[PDB]
């Protein structure tokens, strides 16, 4: 009974491993070898956005790429105008402990969550000239880690109880749940089609979930420790993950296998937050060593350093148009680089 | 800048003024963190001085917050690294799970992001320990063989009115945690042990003194004196 089930599971796992090993014919480093390197890239602090009184723990750029929402552990949710260093709004949160932040694609709502297990949605552009809590989505058992919008009505939230959940804002209750992870789901990212999303947990593995049917499609394991952040390739068929292994890894969707690993002997610190560029040629990263390391997406060579922060960089964002990159660190100042 | 832009700058200045006033009000309080396990009287000790639960108290007109989150705390413990202290309460009477308490203290003490956050240790349930060591049914040497060769350190003077066996047991338990703390302390963050009971009422004065010492060390560090 149990022995037969274990044997069948082992046989299926070995079959999948053989299938993915047989599909690996040529390394991507061997294909893009004769491609001109991006060269050394220097980016300066164009705008420093001061006004947070505690460590910034999340971030998000608006669809317009002009307004960015920053969540910090002092209980505020400032919505900066990035061009002019202007604070459009300053939302005081019910609970100081905030670990995520999201700005809706339409722009009307923001969302924040933390150790309170509740994802709060704030409505911004309304009457009476105030931002007020619209829906306090509750139902997660562990701490909330990353919340991301789909439309004005649907949200995806990953929690510390080894699960993700797709909520309807109007109903206030989960419409879909995704389970199967063993450790805390520490990060989340969507796809341009908004039909699939990849989530990384502390069991040193990532999974690909489907929003509609709610069934896992692929699982990726190439990491030795917890995946502290994940970002998704602009194409829609790949993504990149950052662990505490001091290594990034580029995974793909169709071939179901790791493509490259980004690492350097000099860096040992964990990776907090990863992001791509608009084209996908360049891959930003953020490290615990109080700076950022720029890695080419096709050469795995350190293309530059963004050493402007005093404490560890927490969140890392790239605008929709790709004009600038915003790095928010525990120094309470988040900077714009270009 | 046009009229709308100067007005937006004025609104931003009002927003920043409100933020700075709120921050000045918020920085006045000393945040803590309550950590422990099952069968540890963290609930009792917090009730005596009274997702995430919070208690608020104040002594000498100084305000405190004590947060306790209701395993695998290696992730959410990143948030509590600006706290002035971490409060660690353990069931020193229990011998079966005291070793996993030592392992937990190793986990928090050697944490990467708590590399400068001092810890306050409360060896709770001291009267249970006294009655257990008077009963003699359970021996510490059964669980910790090195207890047999351990002797009570000199210049101890715990308090007048306990048996030598009780003091020996409690001092051994304290020394285990102290050695774990001092293995890799490096002087950035230190450990404050205390023998708390279930009925003791002076559990806020101890925390006040410990927070005062932590702030004194931080002030020494900022003045470049150390």
């Amino acid at each position, epitope marked *: 009974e149990l022995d037969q089930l274990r044997q069948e599971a082992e046989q299926l796992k070995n079959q999948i491993r053989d299938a993915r090993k047989a599909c690996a014919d040529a390394t991507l480093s061997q294909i893009t070898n004769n491609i001109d390197p991006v060269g050394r890239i220097q980016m300066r602090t164009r705008r420093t956005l001061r006004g947070h009184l505690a460590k910034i723990y999340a971030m998000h750029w608006g669809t317009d790429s002009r307004l960015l929402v920053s969540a910090s552990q002092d209980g505020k949710l400032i919505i900066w105008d990035s061009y002019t260093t202007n604070k*459009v*709004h300053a939302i005081p949160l019910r609970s100081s402990w905030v670990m995520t932040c999201a700005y809706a694609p339409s722009g009307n709502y923001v969302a924040c969550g933390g150790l309170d297990n509740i994802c709060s949605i704030y409505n911004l552009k309304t009457r*009476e000239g*105030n931002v007020r809590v619209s829906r306090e989505l509750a139902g997660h058992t562990g701490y909330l880690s990353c919340c991301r919008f789909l439309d004005d009505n649907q949200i995806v939230t990953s929690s510390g109880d080894t699960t993700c959940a797709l909520w309807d804002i109007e109903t206030g209750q989960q419409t879909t749940t995704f389970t199967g992870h063993t450790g805390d789901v520490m990060s989340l990212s969507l796809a341009p089609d908004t039909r699939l999303f990849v989530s990384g947990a502390c069991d040193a593995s990532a999974k690909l979930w489907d929003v509609r049917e709610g069934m896992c499609r692929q699982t990726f394991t190439g990491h030795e420790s917890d995946i502290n952040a994940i970002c998704f390739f602009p194409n829609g068929n790949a993504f990149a993950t950052g662990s505490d292994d001091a290594t990034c890894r580029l995974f793909d969707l169709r071939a179901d296998q790791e493509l490259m690993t980004y690492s350097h002997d000099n860096i040992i610190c964990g990776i907090t937050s990863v992001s791509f560029s608009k084209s996908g040629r360049l891959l930003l990263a953020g490290y615990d060593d109080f700076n950022c390391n720029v890695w080419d997406a096709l050469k795995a060579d350190r293309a530059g350093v963004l050493a402007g922060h005093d404490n560890r960089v927490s969140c890392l964002g790239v605008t929709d148009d790709g004009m600038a990159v915003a790095t928010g660190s525990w120094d309470s100042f988040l900077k714009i680089w270009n | 800048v046009s*009229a709308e832009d100067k007005a937006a700058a*004025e*609104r931003s200045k009002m927003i920043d003024k409100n933020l700075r006033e709120d921050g000045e009000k918020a920085r006045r309080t000393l945040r803590l963190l309550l950590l422990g396990a099952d069968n540890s009287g963290k609930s009792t000790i917090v009730k005596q001085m009274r997702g995430i639960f919070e208690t608020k108290f104040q002594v000498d007109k100084v305000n405190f917050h004590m947060f306790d989150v209701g395993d695998e705390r290696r992730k959410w413990i990143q948030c509590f690294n600006d706290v002035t202290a971490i409060i660690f309460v353990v069931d020193s009477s229990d011998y079966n799970r005291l070793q996993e308490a030592l392992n937990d203290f190793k986990s928090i003490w050697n944490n990467r992001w708590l590399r400068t956050i001092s810890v306050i240790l409360f060896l709770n349930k001291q009267d249970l320990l006294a009655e257990k060591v008077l009963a003699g049914k359970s021996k510490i040497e059964d669980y910790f063989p090195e207890f047999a060769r351990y002797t009570t350190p000199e210049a101890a003077t715990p308090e007048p009115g306990d048996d030598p066996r009780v003091t020996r047991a409690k001092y051994f338990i304290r020394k285990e945690f102290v050695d774990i703390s001092t293995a890799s302390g490096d002087g950035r963050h230190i450990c404050y042990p205390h023998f708390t009971c279930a009925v003791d009422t002076e559990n806020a004065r101890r925390i006040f003194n410990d927070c005062k010492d932590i702030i004194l060390q931080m002030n020494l560090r900022e003045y470049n004196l150390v």
Partner: single-chain antibody
Amino acid sequence: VQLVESGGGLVQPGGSRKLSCSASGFAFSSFGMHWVRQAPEKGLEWVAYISSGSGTIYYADTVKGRFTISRDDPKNTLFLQMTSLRSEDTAMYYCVRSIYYYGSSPFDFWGQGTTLTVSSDIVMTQATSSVPVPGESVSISCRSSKSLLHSNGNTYLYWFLQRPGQSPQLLIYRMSNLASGVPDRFSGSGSGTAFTLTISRLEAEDVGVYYCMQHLEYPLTFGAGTKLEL
């Protein structure tokens, strides 16, 4: 939201008067406030402006030195003090709210006006005064003395509709954006010194007078207005 203003009446010239406006349904501290007068035989024209926190206070040229504006947030009230009024000062006074942040819609709500009977500037022109017109698209053209295009790329033109015997309501802010609740039929397009307003599928209760305002710099200037009749 409601804005109700009390004051006015038959006052001999040279006297002193106070108008008090009370606001309900919104946070009064956040919004900035405007006092705007409309003569019985003339169009709208700016009078005074008080900012949030009362940090900045602006007055028109005509009423500078003999008018005063102030606000009380805890009472949620606005005080306008008028000294040594003139014979042409007889008009209806409106209180207008405007919030000033990126993407905001200023002048969105106009309070109910009072009545007060007595006993350089960017010149904006509306060529058409009365246009007879339902079911037909109507275009209203407003000309500005100078280009209303700042360096940052924001054009500052606002369109207001006044219904017969009713306070004006904001229609288009910054010449492109449509305020909340404004039907999709209205549209606005143009460039510096030449702006248009297009209305499609006109129906009942759509008539009124449309005023064009510039917010490029103080003092604010209103257009003469274009009247629409059946």
